[PDB]
């Protein structure tokens, strides 16, 4: 019992570290100033973004020459590109969750299709503070006020998440906590169209225990942390559906053929 | 065993289960008996169509009272005004319930109201779970029963108000919770702290902190074979939000299709910029 819980806890942690480049500990260190010795390039306005490209050579999303002429759009484009990377990082992590690869292939896909956003938002918080967000592997920091400062719906998107990031991080969880947490979200037995809910649930349950214990040791001081963390899941749901809203709101823009398919 | 510290938590539990019973006429226990047939005095008149809908008023005093001129021309509407007045009495009860929550009235008055503001529908739909089974829901304080099918037809929008409700009720009722559990859970929902505009959020959380602690011991004690019932119930809080919103969405649509339908004042300040 209290044996396995601490075993599965370390595994997930050890795995999460081996799947996510920029950890919560890292990103945290940076933002503050603490030992890393190489401050980030601050995108605070236009000339900053402009200079940013050729410095943080995040010239990944930036390239696709001829669709590189309108900040707000070239940014959101980039957000998506890195979002696709995350998904691969997540899917990989998923498969280290004890039992996950043993499920019906169909349900794995399903659990993943419905869990990446909630997971993306959760981790994103790790890289943002009340003032801004860490971009490009930690190299940059795009101020928060610059984001609200975007043309159309292009300036609403990031405002919510900031609002959500502030509360979430107010719980002061670290990578060892988040690792378990994230697996719980993945093993969500309510994802639409599943086929065999029992296994999933039997797994999430084992996960929920591991997490509850993880919280009591790593946080003796904080009462009912486990409960507060679970409630946050509601914030993710709302947040995610909402995001999926403007995604359709934005479908009145950008007005390559292969570019689209990749997304 | 349960020593010193835990002892205080059982009290809070009993204190609330007690206000709950005193605040709600139709507990879940009574609702179950009525629905499961362990009765020859508690059997409800079933409504699955106009036939019985007609004999509805001519068979059961309607605690589903549709007031605006006793009747109209639109049944679905007729139904809806009922579901409307009823909802109001619940907000009324729930409010009398909240007051009993240790500390709730010792908070700033503005905050008290915003807690109720957002907490009311979330609580209304939890309670509503108690009155439902896959085939329908009780009405007129148990005296009646409306089948899921009749509701699902009604009309254009109106045939879509209750489905999300039945959908969650089935999943929710599955936790097999009883009034004593619900009473603590209901208190947690009110004392959130993530409610829009709470002036002083902190004291609100010390309250929920204790309620959550109560709910955790209660569930432990009342369901020794329920692995992680605590967490599973907390997760159910999202389904609640979706229900609420998805409903408000629905409401606004009705606010145009039906230029003549009256919405209860109170019911309106709940949604006001909700
Ligand atoms: C913003 C950019 C990056 C977020 C991705 C990962 C952060 C975690 C890093 C930890 C090391 C993107 C979003 O906020 C929204 C994401 C997806 C929605 C778009 C869906 C699509 O493009 O198909
Ligand atoms: C209620 C639909 C039917 C009522 C069911 C049972 C009545 C018997 C109770 C015995 C104690 C649907 C809702 O309650 C609607 C919720 C809130 C109304 C506010 C305005 C709105 O959102 O429509």
UniProtKB/Swiss-Prot annotation, chain A:
Q: Which GO terms describe its cellular component?
A: chromatin; cytosol; intracellular membrane-bounded organelle; nucleoplasm; nucleus; receptor complex; RNA polymerase II transcription regulator complex
> Region entry Interaction with FAM120B: which residue ranges?
1-46
Q: Where is this motif: 9aaTAD?
A: 257-263
Activity modulation: PDPK1 activates its transcriptional activity independently of its kinase activity.
Record function comment: Nuclear receptor that binds peroxisome proliferators such as hypolipidemic drugs and fatty acids. Once activated by a ligand, the nuclear receptor binds to DNA specific PPAR response elements (PPRE) and modulates the transcription of its target genes, such as acyl-CoA oxidase. It therefore controls the peroxisomal beta-oxidation pathway of fatty acids. Key regulator of adipocyte differentiation and glucose homeostasis. ARF6 acts as a key regulator of the tissue-specific adipocyte P2 (aP2) enhancer.
PTM summary from the entry reads: Phosphorylated in basal conditions and dephosphorylated when treated with the ligand. May be dephosphorylated by PPP5C. Ubiquitinated by E3 ubiquitin-protein ligase complex containing FBXO9; leading to proteasomal degradation. Ubiquitinated at Lys-18 by TRIM55 leading to proteasomal degradation. Ubiquitinated by E3 ubiquitin-protein ligase STUB1/CHIP; leading to proteasomal degradation.
What induces or represses expression of this protein, per its UniProt record? (Microbial infection) Expression increases when incubated with M.tuberculosis or its lipoprotein LpqH; induction is TLR2-dependent (at protein level).
Q: How does it assemble?
A: Interacts with FOXO1 (acetylated form). Heterodimer with other nuclear receptors, such as RXRA. The heterodimer with the retinoic acid receptor RXRA is called adipocyte-specific transcription factor ARF6. Interacts with NCOA6 coactivator, leading to a strong increase in transcription of target genes. Interacts with coactivator PPARBP, leading to a mild increase in transcription of target genes. Interacts with NOCA7 in a ligand-inducible manner. Interacts with NCOA1 and NCOA2 LXXLL motifs. Interacts with ASXL1, ASXL2, DNTTIP2, FAM120B, MAP2K1/MEK1, NR0B2, PDPK1, PRDM16, PRMT2 and TGFB1I1.
Keywords from the UniProt entry: Activator, Biological rhythms, Cytoplasm, Diabetes mellitus, Disease variant, DNA-binding, Glycoprotein, Isopeptide bond, Metal-binding, Nucleus, Obesity, Phosphoprotein, Receptor, Transcription, Transcription regulation, Ubl conjugation, Zinc, Zinc-finger
Q: Does the keyword Transcription regulation apply?
A: yes
Q: Which domain of life is it from?
A: Eukaryota
Q: What is known of its domains?
A: The 9aaTAD motif is a transactivation domain present in a large number of yeast and animal transcription factors.
Q: For rosiglitazone, which residues are the binding ones? A: 80-83, 117, 243, 263
Family (UniProt): Belongs to the nuclear hormone receptor family. NR1 subfamily.
Its localization reads: Nucleus; Cytoplasm
Primary location recorded for the protein, binned into one broad class: nucleus
Question: Which protein, by its recorded name, is this?
Answer: Peroxisome proliferator-activated receptor gamma
Among the record's GO biological process terms, what is one?
Answer: peroxisome proliferator activated receptor signaling pathway
The signal sequence is: none
* UniProt tissue specificity: Highest expression in adipose tissue. Lower in skeletal muscle, spleen, heart and liver. Also detectable in placenta, lung and ovary.
The record's GO molecular-function terms, alphabetically, read: alpha-actinin binding; arachidonate binding; chromatin binding; DNA binding; DNA binding domain binding; DNA-binding transcription activator activity, RNA polymerase II-specific; DNA-binding transcription factor activity; DNA-binding transcription factor activity, RNA polymerase II-specific
Which residue intervals define the domain NR LBD in the entry?
4-263
Cross-link named Glycyl lysine isopeptide (Lys-Gly) (interchain with G-Cter in ubiquitin), where?
18
């Amino acid at each position: 019992e209290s044996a396995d819980l601490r075993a599965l806890a370390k595994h997930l942690y050890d795995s999460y570290i081996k799947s996510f480049p920029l950890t919560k500990a890292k990103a945290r260190a940076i933002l503050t100033g603490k030992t890393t010795d190489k401050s980030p390039f601050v995108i605070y306005d236009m000339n900053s973004l402009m200079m940013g490209e050729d410095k943080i050579k995040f010239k990944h999303i930036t390239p696709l020459q001829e669709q590189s002429k309108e900040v707000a759009i070239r940014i959101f484009q980039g957000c998506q590109f890195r979002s696709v990377e995350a998904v691969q990082e997540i899917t990989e992590y998923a498969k280290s969750i004890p039992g996950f690869v043993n499920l019906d292939l169909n349900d794995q896909v399903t659990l993943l299709k419905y869990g990446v956003h909630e997971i993306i938002y959760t981790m994103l918080a790790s890289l943002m503070n009340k003032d801004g967000v860490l971009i490009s592997e930690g190299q940059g920091f795009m101020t928060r006020e610059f984001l609200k400062s975007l043309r159309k719906p292009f300036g609403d998107f990031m405002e919510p998440k900031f609002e959500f990031a502030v509360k979430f991080n107010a719980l002061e969880l670290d990578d060892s906590d988040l690792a378990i947490f994230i697996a719980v979200i993945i093993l969500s037995g309510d994802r639409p169209g599943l086929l065999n809910v029992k296994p999933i649930e039997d797994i999430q349950d084992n996960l929920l225990q591991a997490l509850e214990l993880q919280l009591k040791l790593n946080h003796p001081e904080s009462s009912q942390l486990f409960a507060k963390l679970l409630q946050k899941m509601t914030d993710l749901r709302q947040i995610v559906t909402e995001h999926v809203q403007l995604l359709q709101v934005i479908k009145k823009t950008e007005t390559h053929p292969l570019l689209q398919e990749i997304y």
